[PDB]
Amino acid sequence: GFVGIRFCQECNNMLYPKEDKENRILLYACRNCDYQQEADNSCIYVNKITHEVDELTQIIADVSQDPTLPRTEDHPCQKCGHKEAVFFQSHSARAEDAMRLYYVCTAPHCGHRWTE
């Protein structure tokens, strides 16, 4: 997937990846403490190029009460069956790549985000 950040426990700085020459394992090392923790996921770096199309997580559920957004009745919510949804487009660097319509259910306390 993609690598997060780890934080030291004592000094609460970021943990750098360090390789030990004895066991030859991966360990995340604080570079201000003597703290070291053993790695759990051995991926140090990930760079995405084309696999970041998914804006469905970036959408929040609060946007359904935007009065300036279009509303539709043709696409019902798959979660709660509500007839009415707010649709809009991608608002990002990859907005030039599509008019993929993202739909948000307008029912209060549902907030289901879907596409097509």
Partner: protein, 172 residues
């Protein structure tokens, strides 16, 4: 562009920029008033009092569950590795000021005055305002990260809600 909204000193703009790619990452720096050189942003956060990286990234990144925004702040943490204490960061600020006095404590006091009265004065100029200044500076960094991630659209110079009009009152 920060103005005190009642006292109306000369409006002290602060820039928080990212360097272009053309270095092992893309790096966030600050352009403070009365500091003729740039400062990397994590040194400014350590000069404001927060020494740990978790505290600084709590002031910048509000949800730790998106690591894409973590990947962009790591170089700024990397070149502020050598700076781990508040007075060390304040010396870093003061050694780039308008007239850096050779006394170390003079540099410390000058940097404290710059980051209190001349950096983000609309947030506050009194004492005990470093948490609010850090929260707003982290907000500026967070907005810069969002615009660089494509997650927020860039601002328009000529959008007219971004403008204000000086009538006879403010001019006089």
């Amino acid at each position: 562009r920060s103005c005190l909204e009642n006292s109306s000193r000369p409006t002290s703009t602060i820039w928080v920029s990212m360097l272009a790619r053309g270095a092992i990452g893309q790096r966030i720096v600050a352009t403070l008033p009365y500091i003729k050189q740039e400062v990397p942003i994590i040194i400014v956060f350590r000069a404001l009092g927060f020494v740990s990286d978790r505290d600084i990234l709590e002031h910048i990144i509000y949800d730790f569950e998106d690591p894409e925004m973590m990947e962009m702040v790591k170089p700024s943490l990397d070149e502020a590795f050598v700076i781990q204490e508040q007075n060390v960061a304040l010396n870093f600020i003061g050694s780039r000021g308008a007239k850096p006095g050779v006394t170390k404590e003079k540099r410390i006091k000058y940097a404290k005055e710059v980051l209190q009265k001349e950096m983000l004065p609309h947030v506050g100029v009194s004492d005990f305002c470093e948490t609010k200044k850090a929260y707003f500076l982290g907000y500026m960094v967070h907005r810069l990260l969002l615009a660089a991630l494509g997650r927020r659209e860039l601002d328009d110079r000529d959008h007219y809600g971004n403008k204000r009009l000086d009538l006879a009152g403010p001019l006089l």
